[PDB]
Amino acid sequence: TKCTLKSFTVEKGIYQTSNFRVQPTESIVRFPNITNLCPFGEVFNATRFASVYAWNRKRISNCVADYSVLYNSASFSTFKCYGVSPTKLNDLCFTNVYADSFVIRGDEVRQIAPGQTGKIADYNYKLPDDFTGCVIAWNSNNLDSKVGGNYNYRYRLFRKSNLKPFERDISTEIYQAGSKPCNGVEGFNCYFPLQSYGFQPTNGVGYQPYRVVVLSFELLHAPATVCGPKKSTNLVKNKCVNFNFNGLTGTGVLTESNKKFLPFQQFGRDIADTTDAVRDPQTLEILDITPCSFGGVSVITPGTNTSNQVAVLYQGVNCTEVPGSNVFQTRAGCLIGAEHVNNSYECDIPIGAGICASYQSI
Amino acid sequence: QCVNLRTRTQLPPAYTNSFTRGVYYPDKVFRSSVLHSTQDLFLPFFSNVTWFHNPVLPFNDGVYFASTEKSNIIRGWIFGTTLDSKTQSLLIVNNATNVVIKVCEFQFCNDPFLDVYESGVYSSANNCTFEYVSQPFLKNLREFVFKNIDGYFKIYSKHTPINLVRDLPQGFSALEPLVDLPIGINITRFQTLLALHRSAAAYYVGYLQPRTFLLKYNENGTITDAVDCALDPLSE
Numbered sequence: 001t002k003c004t005l006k007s008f009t010v011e012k013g014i015y016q017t018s019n020f021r022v023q024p025t026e027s028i029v030r031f032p033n034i035t036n037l038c039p040f041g042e043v044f045n046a047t048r049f050a051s052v053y054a055w056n057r058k059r060i061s062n063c064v065a066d067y068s069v070l071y072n073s074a075s076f077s078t079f080k081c082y083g084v085s086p087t088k089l090n091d092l093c094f095t096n097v098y099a100d101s102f103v104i105r106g107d108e109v110r111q112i113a114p115g116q117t118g119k120i121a122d123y124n125y126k127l128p129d130d131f132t133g134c135v136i137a138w139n140s141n142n143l144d145s146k147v148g149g150n151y152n153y154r155y156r157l158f159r160k161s162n163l164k165p166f167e168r169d170i171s172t173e174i175y176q177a178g179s180k181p182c183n184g185v186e187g188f189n190c191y192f193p194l195q196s197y198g199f200q201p202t203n204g205v206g207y208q209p210y211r212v213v214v215l216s217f218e219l220l221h222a223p224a225t226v227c228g229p230k231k232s233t234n235l236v237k238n239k240c241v242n243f244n245f246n247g248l249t250g251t252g253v254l255t256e257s258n259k260k261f262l263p264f265q266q267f268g269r270d271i272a273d274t275t276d277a278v279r280d281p282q283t284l285e286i287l288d289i290t291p292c293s294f295g296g297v298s299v300i301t302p303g304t305n306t307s308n309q310v311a312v313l314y315q316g317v318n319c320t321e322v323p324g325s326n327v328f329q330t331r332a333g334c335l336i337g338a339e340h341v342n343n344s345y346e347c348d349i350p351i352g353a354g355i356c357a358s359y360q361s362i
Numbered sequence: 363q364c365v366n367l368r369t370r371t372q373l374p375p376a377y378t379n380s381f382t383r384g385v386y387y388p389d390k391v392f393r394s395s396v397l398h399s400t401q402d403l404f405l406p407f408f409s410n411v412t413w414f415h416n417p418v419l420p421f422n423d424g425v426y427f428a429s430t431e432k433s434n435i436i437r438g439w440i441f442g443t444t445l446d447s448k449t450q451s452l453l454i455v456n457n458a459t460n461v462v463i464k465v466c467e468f469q470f471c472n473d474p475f476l477d478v479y480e481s482g483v484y485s486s487a488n489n490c491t492f493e494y495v496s497q498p499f500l501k502n503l504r505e506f507v508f509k510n511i512d513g514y515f516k517i518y519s520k521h522t523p524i525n526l527v528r529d530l531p532q533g534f535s536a537l538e539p540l541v542d543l544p545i546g547i548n549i550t551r552f553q554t555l556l557a558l559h560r561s562a563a564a565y566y567v568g569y570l571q572p573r574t575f576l577l578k579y580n581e582n583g584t585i586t587d588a589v590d591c592a593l594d595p596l597s598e
């Protein structure tokens with residue numbers, strides 16, 4: 001009081017010093033049930049993969065996919081992410097995904113990389129230098145390699161030019177290395193552009209078959225498809241907290257409400273555009289929001305010239321959230337530091353709602 | 363298996379009165395016993411709605427579709443710009459079991475028709491992008507509102523059992539949202555789909571315009587009455 005009045009002495013009366021408000025305790029987030037998972041079991045646990053120059057292409061959109069669980073798996077030899085790190089990949093997302101899967105040798109595992117050149121990198125699969133996405137490779141010697149030789153797999157060896165990024169060519173035309181034309185039969189200057197892999201169970205690391213899947217992403221102006229799932233902590237009521245219900249954020253205290261939302265609304269507001277009720281995306285029940293309590297504080301003093309003990313009034317605040325004497329609850333708020341009597345005298349220092357205080361103690 | 367017909371589908375282009383039909387929920391916000399003024403694309407009151415008794419028609423900003431259906435002859439809708447494989451085409455079909463929505467570069471015949479004894483209105487379907495299946499939509503009045511804003515296709519619907527003889531009833535009935543599609547297309551024209559036996563249909567079509575309405579919400583959150591704010595001066 002002395003500081004607000006900027007004086008060393010105070011006369012009798014009531015003065016307004018500062019304000020008061022409840023502080024939020026913790027945070028909660030609510031999101032609907034996680035379902036419609038993207039089916040990667042048929043991709044990364046597929047029995048058979050295609051050739052390197054005939055790589056299988058899969059389009060991914062309109063589902064939910066979690067990349068943390070895939071990243072945590074130790075069954076993948078190479079997990080190289082270029083555009084983004086695997087940790088933060090679960091947050092950001094794209095409007096479509098392309099998965100290119102094939103099988104190569106273990107010595108060619110680094111051919112599939114931005115700014116990389118080679119036989120496979122120029123004749124079978126090509127990536128842009130600015131490619132964004134991830135590459136996952138894993139040995140499949142016990143599965144893809146055969147004791148009789150995995151000659152089913154094929155690779156492109158001969159081509160006049162290179163391959164454009166994200167281009168697949170399965171043409172089997174007889175390559176013409178020289179100038180001599182060939183009538184569909186390879187000659188001195190003609191060779192088959194395609195050669196079969198020679199995998200065996202015992203061939204060594206580098207010659208072992210390796211399944212490689214490359215995930216690429218694109219962000220066309222279409223609405224966003226699959227993103228990482230969102231966690232949902234449980235809800236707590238009757239406590240001043242801040243909430244993020246499905247993108248609707250705000251502070252307050254949450255209670256049970258008897259309003260009846262018609263089956264397609266999400267939340268309600270009363271007037272002047274202030275939200276009052278919400279519907280939790282999981283339990284599908286109507287809640288109620290009430291702002292956390294606040295109000296000004298005032299000090300009642302008989303004057304520095306007489307005493308030095310004072311009483312304190314919190315305006316419009318229930319006597320349940322106070323933070324050493326008797327406490328009185330009045331229609332004007334809550335009062336601490338003064339004693340309530342049954343008499344009735346002439347009013348000295350107005351307080352309100354028909355009551356007032358005076359000095360005798362206060 | 364699509365063959366053009368000999369007789370012309372020259373349905374009469376009659377006109378009739380819109381009255382106070384075509385009011386839908388602008389959003390998903392609950393309000394109780396309050397008057398709220400909102401500006402959006404609506405069908406103006408007492409407008410001139412066209413009556414057909416199936417040419418390509420423009421889409422404009424939105425479309426209001428209504429049908430006094432008897433025995434479910436209408437079956438679907440076709441949306442697009444060039445109506446061929448050059449541009450993405452939206453196809454909506456409602457057969458007995460479910461409803462199918464596809465976004466593909468279909469090659470439609472000049473006189474599409476569903477056939478009865480599934481789909482034979484398109485020669486081929488290539489480069490498909492979006493697919494969707496859901497529950498069937500359907501002496502009944504079927505009202506639909508189609509809107510397309512920023513790569514979002516909004517479909518609102520309402521069914522009403524009516525017994526009046528000829529014209530649209532003098533009453534109020536709001537349209538509740540039905541489906542939203544997150545697909546980016548720039549539709550400009552549309553069509554109707556009929557499943558007719560090889561061996562003459564009536565509906566009503568109107569267009570939407572931007573304007574402001576005053577809406578009344580009762581205690582339970584249902585729209586019960588509306589006022590057009592650009593009409594006779596009493597409304598203003």
Ligand SMILES: *[C@@H]1O[C@H](CO)[C@@H](O[C@@H]2O[C@H](CO)[C@@H](O)[C@H](O)[C@H]2NC(C)=O)[C@H](O)[C@H]1NC(C)=O
Pocket residue numbers: 032033281282283284
């Ligand atoms: C999300 O999934 C949970 C898990 O099943 C659902 O919770 C179940 O709800 C039913 C309906 O009353 C109860 O009979 C079960 O006992 C609940 N089980 C659990 C573990 O909570 C919940 O309803 C789902 N929410 C949706 C689909 O919105």
Ligand SMILES: *[C@@H]1O[C@H](CO)[C@@H](O[C@@H]2O[C@H](CO)[C@@H](O)[C@H](O)[C@H]2NC(C)=O)[C@H](O)[C@H]1NC(C)=O
Pocket residue numbers: 318319320
């Ligand atoms: C301050 O909060 C308490 C606790 O909610 C209120 O006491 C409630 O009063 C209502 C009305 O008589 C009763 O129905 C509840 O059972 C009471 N709760 C408890 C725990 O006793 C009190 O009324 C509030 N202060 C004011 C001025 O209303």
Ligand SMILES: *[C@@H]1O[C@H](CO)[C@@H](O[C@@H]2O[C@H](CO)[C@@H](O)[C@H](O)[C@H]2NC(C)=O)[C@H](O)[C@H]1NC(C)=O
Pocket residue numbers: 457458459460462480495
């Ligand atoms: C109505 O259309 C639906 C959608 O295509 C049909 O249901 C599918 O029919 C095919 C053809 O046998 C099946 O392969 C699908 O599994 C069916 N889908 C579902 C969800 O069951 C249905 O058969 C059609 N009915 C008629 C009478 O044409």
Ligand SMILES: *[C@@H]1O[C@H](CO)[C@@H](O[C@@H]2O[C@H](CO)[C@@H](O)[C@H](O)[C@H]2NC(C)=O)[C@H](O)[C@H]1NC(C)=O
Pocket residue numbers: 096220447448449450467489491
């Ligand atoms: C066939 O579909 C593909 C993809 O579904 C289309 O490729 C798109 O072409 C546009 C044209 O500029 C690009 O902006 C997009 O980035 C491409 N990829 C997409 C949309 O994923 C292709 O145009 C389609 N072909 C035809 C004839 O419609």
Ligand SMILES: *[C@@H]1O[C@H](CO)[C@@H](O[C@@H]2O[C@H](CO)[C@@H](O)[C@H](O)[C@H]2NC(C)=O)[C@H](O)[C@H]1NC(C)=O
Pocket residue numbers: 580581582
């Ligand atoms: C709005 O909701 C209220 C609450 O249920 C409805 O009121 C009930 O209506 C039924 C049938 O008309 C009666 O049997 C109940 O006795 C009513 N209860 C109460 C508390 O009013 C009301 O019908 C709904 N519609 C309107 C227009 O008010």
Ligand SMILES: *[C@@H]1O[C@H](CO)[C@@H](O)[C@H](O)[C@H]1NC(C)=O
Pocket residue numbers: 040041042043044045
């Ligand atoms: C493949 O199967 C293994 C064995 O259960 C499992 O751990 C892994 O998550 C599966 N991967 C996919 C993509 O389904």
Ligand SMILES: *[C@@H]1O[C@H](CO)[C@@H](O)[C@H](O)[C@H]1NC(C)=O
Pocket residue numbers: 305306
């Ligand atoms: C209160 O004020 C009066 C008049 O100024 C003075 O006589 C009296 O001493 C004061 N009381 C104190 C200083 O305790």
Ligand SMILES: *[C@@H]1O[C@H](CO)[C@@H](O)[C@H](O)[C@H]1NC(C)=O
Pocket residue numbers: 340341342
């Ligand atoms: C007097 O005051 C006390 C405490 O202030 C209170 O408990 C009591 O009800 C009041 N009335 C009587 C008649 O004692």
Ligand SMILES: *[C@@H]1O[C@H](CO)[C@@H](O)[C@H](O)[C@H]1NC(C)=O
Pocket residue numbers: 377378379380408409410411
């Ligand atoms: C529609 O306009 C025509 C003339 O273009 C008019 O004859 C008819 O009455 C109008 N219908 C209405 C206003 O419902």
Ligand SMILES: *[C@@H]1O[C@H](CO)[C@@H](O)[C@H](O)[C@H]1NC(C)=O
Pocket residue numbers: 546547548
């Ligand atoms: C539709 O065509 C217009 C030009 O006519 C173009 O600006 C717009 O991008 C097209 N829509 C989509 C989704 O590409």
